[PDB]
Coordinates of C-alpha atoms and ligand atoms in Angstrom, one line a residue:
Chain A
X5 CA 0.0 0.0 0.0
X6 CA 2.8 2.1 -0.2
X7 CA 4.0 4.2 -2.7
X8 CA 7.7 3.5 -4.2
X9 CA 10.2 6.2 -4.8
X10 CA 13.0 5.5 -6.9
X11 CA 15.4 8.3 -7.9
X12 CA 18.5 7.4 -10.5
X13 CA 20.7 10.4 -9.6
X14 CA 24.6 11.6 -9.7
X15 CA 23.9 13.7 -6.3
X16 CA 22.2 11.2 -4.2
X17 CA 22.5 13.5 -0.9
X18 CA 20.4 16.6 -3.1
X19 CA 17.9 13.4 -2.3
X20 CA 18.1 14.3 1.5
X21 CA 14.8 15.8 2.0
X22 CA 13.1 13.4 1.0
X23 CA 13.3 11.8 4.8
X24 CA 12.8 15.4 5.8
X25 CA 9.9 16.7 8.0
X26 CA 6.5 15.6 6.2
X27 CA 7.9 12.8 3.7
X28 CA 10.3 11.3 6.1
X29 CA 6.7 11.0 8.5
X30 CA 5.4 9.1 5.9
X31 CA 7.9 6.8 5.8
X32 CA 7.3 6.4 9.1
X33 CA 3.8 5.8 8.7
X34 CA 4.6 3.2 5.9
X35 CA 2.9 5.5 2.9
X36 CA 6.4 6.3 1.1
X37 CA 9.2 4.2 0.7
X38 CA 12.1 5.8 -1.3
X39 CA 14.7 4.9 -3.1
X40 CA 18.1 6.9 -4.1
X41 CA 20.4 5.6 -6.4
X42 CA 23.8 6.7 -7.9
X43 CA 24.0 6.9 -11.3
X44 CA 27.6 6.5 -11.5
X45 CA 27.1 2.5 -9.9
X46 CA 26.1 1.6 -13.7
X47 CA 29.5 3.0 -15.4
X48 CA 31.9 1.0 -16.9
X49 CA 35.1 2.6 -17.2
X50 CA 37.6 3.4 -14.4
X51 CA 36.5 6.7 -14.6
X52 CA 32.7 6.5 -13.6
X53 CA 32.3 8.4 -16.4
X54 CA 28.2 8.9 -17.0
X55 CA 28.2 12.0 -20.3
X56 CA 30.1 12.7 -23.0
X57 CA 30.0 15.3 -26.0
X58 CA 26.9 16.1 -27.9
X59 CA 26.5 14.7 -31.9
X60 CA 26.5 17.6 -34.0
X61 CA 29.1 19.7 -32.2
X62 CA 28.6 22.3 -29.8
X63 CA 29.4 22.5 -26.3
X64 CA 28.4 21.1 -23.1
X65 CA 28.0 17.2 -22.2
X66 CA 25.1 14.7 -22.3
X67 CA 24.4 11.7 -20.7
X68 CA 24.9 8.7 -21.4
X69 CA 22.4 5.9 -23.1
X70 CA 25.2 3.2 -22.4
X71 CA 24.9 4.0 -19.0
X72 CA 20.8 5.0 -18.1
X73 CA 19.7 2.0 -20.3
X74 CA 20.6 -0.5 -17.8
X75 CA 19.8 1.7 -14.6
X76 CA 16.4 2.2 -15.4
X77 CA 16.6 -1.9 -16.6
X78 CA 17.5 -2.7 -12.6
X79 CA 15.7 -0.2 -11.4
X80 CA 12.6 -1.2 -12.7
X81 CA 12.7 -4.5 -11.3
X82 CA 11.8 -2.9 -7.7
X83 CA 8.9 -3.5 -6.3
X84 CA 3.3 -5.9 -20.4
X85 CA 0.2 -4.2 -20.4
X86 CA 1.2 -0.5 -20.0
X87 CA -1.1 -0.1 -17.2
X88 CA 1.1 -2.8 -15.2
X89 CA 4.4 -0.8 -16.5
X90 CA 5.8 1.4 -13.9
X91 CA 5.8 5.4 -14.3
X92 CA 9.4 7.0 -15.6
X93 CA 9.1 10.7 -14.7
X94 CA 12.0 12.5 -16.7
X95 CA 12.3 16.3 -15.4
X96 CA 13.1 18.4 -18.6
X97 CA 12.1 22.2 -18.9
X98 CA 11.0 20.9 -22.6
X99 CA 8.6 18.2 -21.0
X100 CA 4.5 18.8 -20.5
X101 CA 4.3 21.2 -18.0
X102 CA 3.2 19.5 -14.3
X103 CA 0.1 20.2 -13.2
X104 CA -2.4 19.7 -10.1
X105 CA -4.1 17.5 -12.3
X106 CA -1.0 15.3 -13.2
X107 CA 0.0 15.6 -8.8
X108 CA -3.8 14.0 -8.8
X109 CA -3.0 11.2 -10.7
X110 CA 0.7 10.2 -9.8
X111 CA -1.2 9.8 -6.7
X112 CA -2.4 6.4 -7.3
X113 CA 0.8 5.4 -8.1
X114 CA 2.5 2.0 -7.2
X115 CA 5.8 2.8 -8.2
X116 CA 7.3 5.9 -9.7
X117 CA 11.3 6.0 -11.0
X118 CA 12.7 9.3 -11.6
X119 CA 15.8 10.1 -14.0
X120 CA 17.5 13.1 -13.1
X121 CA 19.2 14.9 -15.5
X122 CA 22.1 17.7 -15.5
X123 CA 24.2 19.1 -17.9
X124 CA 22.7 19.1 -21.5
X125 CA 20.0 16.2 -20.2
X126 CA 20.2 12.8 -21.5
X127 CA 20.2 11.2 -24.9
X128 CA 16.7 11.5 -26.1
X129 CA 16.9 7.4 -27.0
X130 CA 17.2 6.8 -23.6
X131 CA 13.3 8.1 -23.1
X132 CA 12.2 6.2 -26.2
X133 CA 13.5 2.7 -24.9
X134 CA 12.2 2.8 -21.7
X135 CA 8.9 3.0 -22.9
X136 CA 9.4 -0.7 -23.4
X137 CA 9.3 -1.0 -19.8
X138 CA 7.7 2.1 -18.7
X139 CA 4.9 4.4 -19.1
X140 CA 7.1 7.6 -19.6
X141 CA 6.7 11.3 -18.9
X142 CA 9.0 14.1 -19.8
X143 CA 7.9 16.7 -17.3
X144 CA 8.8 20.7 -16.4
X145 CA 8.1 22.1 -12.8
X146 CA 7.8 25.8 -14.6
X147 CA 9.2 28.0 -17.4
X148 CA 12.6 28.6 -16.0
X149 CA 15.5 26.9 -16.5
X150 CA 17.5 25.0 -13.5
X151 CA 21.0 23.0 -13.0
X152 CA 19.8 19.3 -12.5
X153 CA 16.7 17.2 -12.0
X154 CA 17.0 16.1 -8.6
X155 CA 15.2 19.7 -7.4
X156 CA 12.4 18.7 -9.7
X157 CA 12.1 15.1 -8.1
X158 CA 11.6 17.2 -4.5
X159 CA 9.0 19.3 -6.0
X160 CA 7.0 16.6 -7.7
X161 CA 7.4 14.6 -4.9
X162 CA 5.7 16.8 -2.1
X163 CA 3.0 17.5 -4.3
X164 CA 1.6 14.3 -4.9
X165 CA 2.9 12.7 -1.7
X166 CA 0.7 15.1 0.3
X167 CA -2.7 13.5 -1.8
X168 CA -1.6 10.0 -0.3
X169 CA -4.2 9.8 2.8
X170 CA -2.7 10.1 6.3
X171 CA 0.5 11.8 4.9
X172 CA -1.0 15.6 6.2
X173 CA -2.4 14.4 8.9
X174 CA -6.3 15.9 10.6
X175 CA -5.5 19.5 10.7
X176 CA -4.1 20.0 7.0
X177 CA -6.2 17.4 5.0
X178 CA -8.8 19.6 4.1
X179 CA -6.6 25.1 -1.7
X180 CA -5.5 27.0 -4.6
X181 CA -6.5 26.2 -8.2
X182 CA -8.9 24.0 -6.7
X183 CA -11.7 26.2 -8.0
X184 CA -9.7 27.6 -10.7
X185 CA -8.7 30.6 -8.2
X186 CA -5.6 31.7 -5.9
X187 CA -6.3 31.1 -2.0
X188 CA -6.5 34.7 -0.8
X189 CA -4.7 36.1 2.5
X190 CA -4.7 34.0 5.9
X191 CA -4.4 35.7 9.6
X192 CA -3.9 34.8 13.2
X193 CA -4.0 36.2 16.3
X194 CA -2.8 38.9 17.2
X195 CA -5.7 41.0 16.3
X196 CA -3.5 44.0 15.6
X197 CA 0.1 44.1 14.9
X198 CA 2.0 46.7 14.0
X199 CA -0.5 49.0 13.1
X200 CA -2.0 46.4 11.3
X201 CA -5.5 45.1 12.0
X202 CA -7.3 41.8 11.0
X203 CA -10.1 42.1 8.5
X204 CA -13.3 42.6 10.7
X205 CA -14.9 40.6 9.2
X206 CA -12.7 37.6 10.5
X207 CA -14.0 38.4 13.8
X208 CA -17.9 38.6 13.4
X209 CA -18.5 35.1 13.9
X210 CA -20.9 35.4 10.8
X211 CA -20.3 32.1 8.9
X212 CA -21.7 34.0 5.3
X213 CA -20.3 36.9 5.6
X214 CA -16.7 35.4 6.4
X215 CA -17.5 32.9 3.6
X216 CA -18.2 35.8 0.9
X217 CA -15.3 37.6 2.1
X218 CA -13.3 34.4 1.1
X219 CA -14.4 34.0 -2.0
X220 CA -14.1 38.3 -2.6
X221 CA -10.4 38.2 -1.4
X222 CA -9.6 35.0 -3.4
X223 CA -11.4 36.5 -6.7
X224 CA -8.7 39.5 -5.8
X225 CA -5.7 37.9 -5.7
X226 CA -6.2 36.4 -8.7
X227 CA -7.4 39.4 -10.8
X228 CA -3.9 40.9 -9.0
X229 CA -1.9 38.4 -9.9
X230 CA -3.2 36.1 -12.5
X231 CA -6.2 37.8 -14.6
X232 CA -6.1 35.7 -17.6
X233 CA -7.5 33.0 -15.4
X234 CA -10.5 34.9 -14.6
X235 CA -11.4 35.4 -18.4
X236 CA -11.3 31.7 -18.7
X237 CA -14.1 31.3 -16.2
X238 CA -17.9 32.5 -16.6
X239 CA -18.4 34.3 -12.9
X240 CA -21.9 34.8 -12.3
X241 CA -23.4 38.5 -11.4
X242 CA -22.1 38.7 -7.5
X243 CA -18.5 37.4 -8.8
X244 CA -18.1 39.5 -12.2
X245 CA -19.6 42.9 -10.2
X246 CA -17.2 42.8 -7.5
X247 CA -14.1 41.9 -10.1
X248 CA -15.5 44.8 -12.0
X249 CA -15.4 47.0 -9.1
X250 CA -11.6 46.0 -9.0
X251 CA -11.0 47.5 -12.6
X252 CA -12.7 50.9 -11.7
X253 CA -10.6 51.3 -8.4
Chain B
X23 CA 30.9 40.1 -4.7
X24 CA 29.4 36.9 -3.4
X25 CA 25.1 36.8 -3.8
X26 CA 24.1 36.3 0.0
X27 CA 21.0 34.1 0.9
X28 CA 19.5 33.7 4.1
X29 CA 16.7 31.4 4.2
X30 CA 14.6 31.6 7.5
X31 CA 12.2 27.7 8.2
X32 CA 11.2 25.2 10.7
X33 CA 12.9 22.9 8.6
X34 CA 17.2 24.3 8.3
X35 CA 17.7 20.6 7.4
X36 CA 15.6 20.7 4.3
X37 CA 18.1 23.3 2.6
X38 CA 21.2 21.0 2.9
X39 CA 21.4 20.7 -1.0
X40 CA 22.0 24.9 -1.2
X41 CA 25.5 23.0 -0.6
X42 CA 25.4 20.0 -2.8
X43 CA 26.4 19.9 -6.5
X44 CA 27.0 23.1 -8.2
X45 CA 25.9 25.5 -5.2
X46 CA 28.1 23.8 -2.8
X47 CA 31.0 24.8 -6.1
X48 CA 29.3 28.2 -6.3
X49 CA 30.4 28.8 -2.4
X50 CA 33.9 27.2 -2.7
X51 CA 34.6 29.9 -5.6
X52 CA 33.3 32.6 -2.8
X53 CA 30.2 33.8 -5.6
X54 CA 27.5 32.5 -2.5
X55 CA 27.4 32.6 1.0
X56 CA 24.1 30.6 2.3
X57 CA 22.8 31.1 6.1
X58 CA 19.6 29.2 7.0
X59 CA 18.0 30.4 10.1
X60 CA 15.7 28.1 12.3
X61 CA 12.3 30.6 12.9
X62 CA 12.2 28.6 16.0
X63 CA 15.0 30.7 17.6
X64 CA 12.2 33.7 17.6
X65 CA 9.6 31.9 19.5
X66 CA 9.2 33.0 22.9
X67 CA 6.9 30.4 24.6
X68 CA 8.7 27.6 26.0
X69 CA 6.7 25.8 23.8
X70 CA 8.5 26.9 20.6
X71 CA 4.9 28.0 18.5
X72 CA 5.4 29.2 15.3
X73 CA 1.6 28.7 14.1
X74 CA -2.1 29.4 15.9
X75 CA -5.3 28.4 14.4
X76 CA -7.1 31.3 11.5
X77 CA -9.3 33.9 12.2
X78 CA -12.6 33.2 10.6
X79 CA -12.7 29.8 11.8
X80 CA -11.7 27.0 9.5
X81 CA -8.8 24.2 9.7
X82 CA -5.1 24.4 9.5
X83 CA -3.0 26.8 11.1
X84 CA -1.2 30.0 10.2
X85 CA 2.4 30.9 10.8
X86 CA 2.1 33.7 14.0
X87 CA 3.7 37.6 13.0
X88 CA 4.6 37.7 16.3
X89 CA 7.9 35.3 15.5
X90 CA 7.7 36.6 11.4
X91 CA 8.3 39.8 12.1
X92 CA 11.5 39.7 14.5
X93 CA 13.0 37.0 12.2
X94 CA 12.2 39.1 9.2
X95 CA 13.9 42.2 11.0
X96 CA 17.0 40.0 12.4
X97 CA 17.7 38.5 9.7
X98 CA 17.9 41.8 7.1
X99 CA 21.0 42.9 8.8
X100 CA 22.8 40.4 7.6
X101 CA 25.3 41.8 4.9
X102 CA 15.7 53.6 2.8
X103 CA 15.0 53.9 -0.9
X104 CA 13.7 51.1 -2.0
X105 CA 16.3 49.8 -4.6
X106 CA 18.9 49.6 -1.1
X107 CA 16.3 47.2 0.5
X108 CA 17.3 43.7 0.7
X109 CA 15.0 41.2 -1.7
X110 CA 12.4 39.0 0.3
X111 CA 11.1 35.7 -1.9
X112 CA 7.4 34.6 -0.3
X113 CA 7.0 31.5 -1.8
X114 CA 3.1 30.9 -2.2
X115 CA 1.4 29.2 -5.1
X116 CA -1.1 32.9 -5.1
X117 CA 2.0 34.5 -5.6
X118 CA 3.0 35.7 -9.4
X119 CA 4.9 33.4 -11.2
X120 CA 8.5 32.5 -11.4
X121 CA 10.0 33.4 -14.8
X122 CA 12.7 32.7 -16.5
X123 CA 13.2 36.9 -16.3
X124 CA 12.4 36.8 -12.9
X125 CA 15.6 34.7 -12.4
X126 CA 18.4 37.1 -15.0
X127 CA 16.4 39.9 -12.5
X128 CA 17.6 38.3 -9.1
X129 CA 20.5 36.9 -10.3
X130 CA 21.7 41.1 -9.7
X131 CA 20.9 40.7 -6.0
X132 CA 23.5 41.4 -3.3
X133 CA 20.8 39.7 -0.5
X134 CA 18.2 37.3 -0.7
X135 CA 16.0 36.8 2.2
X136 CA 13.5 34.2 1.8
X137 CA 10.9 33.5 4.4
X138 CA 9.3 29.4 4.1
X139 CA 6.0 29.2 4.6
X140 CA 4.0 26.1 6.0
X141 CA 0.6 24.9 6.8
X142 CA -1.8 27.4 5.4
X143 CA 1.1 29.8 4.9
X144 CA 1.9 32.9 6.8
X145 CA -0.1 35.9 8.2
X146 CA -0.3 38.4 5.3
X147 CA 0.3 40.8 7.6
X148 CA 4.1 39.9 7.6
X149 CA 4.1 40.2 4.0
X150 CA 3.7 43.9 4.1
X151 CA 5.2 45.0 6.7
X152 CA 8.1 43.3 5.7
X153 CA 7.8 46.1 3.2
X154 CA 9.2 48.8 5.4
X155 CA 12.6 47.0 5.4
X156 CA 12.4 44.5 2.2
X157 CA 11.7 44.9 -1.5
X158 CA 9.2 42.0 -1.4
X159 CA 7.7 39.3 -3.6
X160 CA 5.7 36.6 -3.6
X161 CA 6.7 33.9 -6.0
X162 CA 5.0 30.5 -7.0
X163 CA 7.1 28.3 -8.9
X164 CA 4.3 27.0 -11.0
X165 CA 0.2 26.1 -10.8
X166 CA 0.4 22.4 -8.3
X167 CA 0.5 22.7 -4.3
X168 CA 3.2 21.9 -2.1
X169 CA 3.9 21.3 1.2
X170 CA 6.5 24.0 1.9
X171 CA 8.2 26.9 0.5
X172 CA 11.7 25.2 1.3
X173 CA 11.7 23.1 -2.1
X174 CA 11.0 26.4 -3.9
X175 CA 14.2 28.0 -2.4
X176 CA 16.2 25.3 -3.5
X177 CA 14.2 25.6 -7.2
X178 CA 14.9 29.3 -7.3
X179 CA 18.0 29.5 -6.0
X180 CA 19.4 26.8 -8.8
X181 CA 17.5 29.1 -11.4
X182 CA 19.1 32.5 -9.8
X183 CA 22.6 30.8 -8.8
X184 CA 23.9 29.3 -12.5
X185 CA 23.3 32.8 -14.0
X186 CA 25.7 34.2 -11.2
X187 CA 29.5 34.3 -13.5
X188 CA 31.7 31.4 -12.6
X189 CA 28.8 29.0 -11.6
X190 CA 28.8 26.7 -14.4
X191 CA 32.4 26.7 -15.6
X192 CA 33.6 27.1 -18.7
X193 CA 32.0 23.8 -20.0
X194 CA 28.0 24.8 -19.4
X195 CA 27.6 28.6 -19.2
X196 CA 26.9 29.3 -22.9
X197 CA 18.4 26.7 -23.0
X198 CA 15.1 26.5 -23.4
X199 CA 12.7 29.5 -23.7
X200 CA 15.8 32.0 -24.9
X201 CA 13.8 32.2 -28.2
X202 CA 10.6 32.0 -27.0
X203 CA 10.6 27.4 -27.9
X204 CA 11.3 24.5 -25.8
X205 CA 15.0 22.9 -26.6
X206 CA 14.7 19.9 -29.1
X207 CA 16.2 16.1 -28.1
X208 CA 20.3 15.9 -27.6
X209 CA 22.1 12.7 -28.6
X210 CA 25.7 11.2 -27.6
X211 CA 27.8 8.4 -28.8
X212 CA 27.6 5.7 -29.2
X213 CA 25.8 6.0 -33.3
X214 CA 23.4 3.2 -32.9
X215 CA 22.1 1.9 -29.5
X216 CA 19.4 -0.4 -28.8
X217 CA 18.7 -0.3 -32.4
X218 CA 18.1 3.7 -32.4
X219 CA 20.3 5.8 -34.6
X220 CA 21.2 9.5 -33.9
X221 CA 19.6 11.3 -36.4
X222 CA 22.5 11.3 -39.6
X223 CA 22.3 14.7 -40.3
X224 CA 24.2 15.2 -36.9
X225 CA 27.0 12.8 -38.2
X226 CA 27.2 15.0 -41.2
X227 CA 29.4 17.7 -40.7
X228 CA 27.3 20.4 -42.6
X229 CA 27.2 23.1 -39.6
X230 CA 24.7 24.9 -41.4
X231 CA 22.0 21.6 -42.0
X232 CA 23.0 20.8 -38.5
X233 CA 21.7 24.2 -37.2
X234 CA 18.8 24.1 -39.1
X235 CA 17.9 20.5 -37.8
X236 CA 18.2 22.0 -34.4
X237 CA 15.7 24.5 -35.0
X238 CA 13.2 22.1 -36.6
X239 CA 13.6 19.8 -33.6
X240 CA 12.6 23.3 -31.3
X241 CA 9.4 24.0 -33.0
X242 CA 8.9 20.2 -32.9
X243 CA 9.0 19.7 -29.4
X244 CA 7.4 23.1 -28.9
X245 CA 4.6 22.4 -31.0
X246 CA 4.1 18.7 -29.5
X247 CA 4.0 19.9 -25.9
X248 CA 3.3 23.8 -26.0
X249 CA 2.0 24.2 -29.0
X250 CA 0.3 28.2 -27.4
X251 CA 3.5 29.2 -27.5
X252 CA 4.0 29.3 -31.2
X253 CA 0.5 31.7 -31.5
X254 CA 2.2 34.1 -29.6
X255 CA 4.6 34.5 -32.5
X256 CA 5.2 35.5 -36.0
X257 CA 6.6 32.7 -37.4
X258 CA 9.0 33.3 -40.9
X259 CA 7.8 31.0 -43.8
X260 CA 10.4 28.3 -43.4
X261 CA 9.3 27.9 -40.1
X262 CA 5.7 28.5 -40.1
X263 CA 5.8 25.7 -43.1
X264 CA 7.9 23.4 -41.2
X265 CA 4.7 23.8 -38.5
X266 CA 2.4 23.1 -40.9
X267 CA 3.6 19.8 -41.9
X268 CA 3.2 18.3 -38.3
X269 CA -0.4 20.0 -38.4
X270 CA -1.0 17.3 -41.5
X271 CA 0.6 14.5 -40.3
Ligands
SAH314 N1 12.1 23.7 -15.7 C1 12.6 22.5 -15.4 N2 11.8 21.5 -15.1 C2 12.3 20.2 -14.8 N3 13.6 19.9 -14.9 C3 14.4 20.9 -15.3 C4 14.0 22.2 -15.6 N4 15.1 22.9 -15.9 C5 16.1 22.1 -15.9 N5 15.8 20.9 -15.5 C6 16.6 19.7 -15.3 O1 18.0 20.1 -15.3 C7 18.6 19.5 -16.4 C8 19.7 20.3 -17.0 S1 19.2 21.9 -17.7 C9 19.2 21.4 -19.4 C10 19.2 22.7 -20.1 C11 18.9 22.6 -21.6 N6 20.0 23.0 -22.4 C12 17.6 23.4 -21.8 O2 17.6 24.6 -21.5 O3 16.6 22.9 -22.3 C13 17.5 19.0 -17.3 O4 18.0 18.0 -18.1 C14 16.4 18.6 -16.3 O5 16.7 17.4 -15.7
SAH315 N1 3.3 26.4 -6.1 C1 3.9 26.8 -5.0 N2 4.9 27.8 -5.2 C2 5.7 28.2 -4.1 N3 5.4 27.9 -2.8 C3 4.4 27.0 -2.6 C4 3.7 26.4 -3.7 N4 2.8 25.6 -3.1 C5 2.9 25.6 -1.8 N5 3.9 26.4 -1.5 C6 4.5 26.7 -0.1 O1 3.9 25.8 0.8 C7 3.2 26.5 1.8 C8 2.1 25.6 2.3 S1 0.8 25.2 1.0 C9 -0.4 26.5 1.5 C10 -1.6 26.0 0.9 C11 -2.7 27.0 0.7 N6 -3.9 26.5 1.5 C12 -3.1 27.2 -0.8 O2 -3.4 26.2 -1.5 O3 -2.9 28.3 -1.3 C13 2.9 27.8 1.2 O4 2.6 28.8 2.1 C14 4.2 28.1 0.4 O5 5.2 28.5 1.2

């Protein structure tokens, strides 16, 4: 019942957090098992080496097929219809962007290997073979560009490791996007703080009221911060009058 | 010279990797220095709280000003008109996105700050009076929920960090999105590997059908995967034609 992490990595310490505060509880609570694996274990020559230059010229280093090929191979073996195939999850900044959607369904996941990249990435054959023994995704966390893969592993991983039941535990199972908005502004106590004062509202102890107020400051932030979402919605009269009332200032 | 970055969480242990791989490089050139700061060590109660439950009602738990705001303070004189302000990164999922620009910006910064939200995140009250002493953002690094702001530190540090002079050494500091496409697939030796050829042109020696190749392969991939970004463009006729025959197949 629970979900397998395997990681094929050059840095298996960047790996480190994933025994860290709510993913190492998990592994406590026997929902996670993780596993990080060096790279380099798989190379042949004295040297460990695991890239070499790209065809075609240019600069920079790529990795390896002679090398991933028969990682993934082993790697797959732990713990076909491509339903029973495992999921490879390949970070690239070129791969289908992840979503809360994808986090969703990763979820139900049995086993997911992840092939971390650095440098130019890894020979693109690499990704076509292992569909023979995986269901493969090339995946971006975002349109920015970072050093290696591992990062991406972390971020993938707390996102659909939270949706695994009893992994937040009762006070944070209960968020953003969900509705196709941005959560708007929390507060605790104290009610003032440097000059700065609570939302009244907060304070009635007027369930509707608080609940509109939700969904006005939600509605805000996103027409702050991301308004093309709001045009691909239909808001009804209360929602599309106060968004309005946002444009007019 | 060296880009500071102070990262204040409940979780210090979670940013280990700012000195793995080509960070923990970046600090033995001196181009990075890297404090992490428990928020702990500004609770008062004996009991260490760094959270108390909303106003409004509701579940979770929101991180308390009362320890934000002397950690925020503390911390920012650590090595005013505004451009002299130190930069604080909220990492938040309602917060604007992280770009690829965002990242050339940052990688300017002399300080970094960056305060690591958990739970439902952190009073927004902190978030603007931290603008009496910061320049502050709120950043998400892309549209799925995670557990903690501490794996968006270590995703926008890598992005900031490898722009920084020196980072990547001579061999990878010459990517995807510079044009506006995704990169297209890279290849390595060996010719022929699990009965998958590099694509001959590469083996050719013609620098200039080799370039073109390269930029066929970018509107490929771009086109497969993120296909909205090619309407945002005017496309010349060899490439808008080159387009066109995917659209048919
Ligand atoms: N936005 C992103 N999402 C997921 N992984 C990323 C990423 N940016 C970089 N990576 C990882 O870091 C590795 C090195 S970056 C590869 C850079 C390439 N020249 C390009 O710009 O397309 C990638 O192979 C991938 O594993
Ligand atoms: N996409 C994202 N980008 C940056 N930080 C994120 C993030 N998703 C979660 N976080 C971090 O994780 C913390 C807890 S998640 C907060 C969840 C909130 N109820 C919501 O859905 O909006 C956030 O406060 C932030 O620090």
């Amino acid at each position: 019942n629970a979900m397998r992490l395997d990681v094929i990595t050059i840095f298996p310490e960047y790996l480190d957090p994933l025994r860290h505060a709510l993913l190492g509880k998990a592994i406590e609570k026997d929902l996670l098992s993780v596993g990080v694996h060096d790279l380099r274990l798989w190379a042949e020559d004295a040297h460990k080496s695991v890239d070499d230059s790209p065809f075609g010229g240019g600069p920079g280093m790529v990795m390896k097929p002679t090398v991933w090929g028969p990682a993934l191979d082993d790697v797959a073996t732990m713990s076909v219809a491509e339903a029973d195939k495992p999921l490879l999850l390949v970070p690239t900044p070129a791969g289908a962007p992840f979503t809360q959607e994808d986090a969703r369904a990763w979820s139900n996941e049995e086993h997911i290997v992840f092939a971390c990249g650095r440098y130019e990435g890894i020979d693109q054959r690499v990704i076509e073979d292992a569909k023979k023994t995986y269901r493969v995704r090339e995946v971006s966390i975002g349109d920015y560009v970072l050093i290696g893969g591992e990062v991406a592993v972390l971020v993938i991983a707390e996102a659909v490791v939270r949706l695994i039941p009893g992994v937040l535990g009762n006070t944070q199972s209960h968020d953003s996007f969900s509705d196709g908005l941005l959560e708007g502004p929390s507060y605790t106590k104290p009610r003032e703080w440097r000059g700065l004062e609570v939302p009244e509202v907060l304070t009635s102890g007027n369930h509707a009221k608080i609940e509109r107020w939700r969904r006005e400051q939600s509605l805000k932030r996103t027409w702050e911060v991301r308004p093309e979402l709001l045009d691909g919605m239909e808001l009804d009269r209360h929602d599309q009058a106060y968004v309005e009332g946002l444009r007019r200032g």
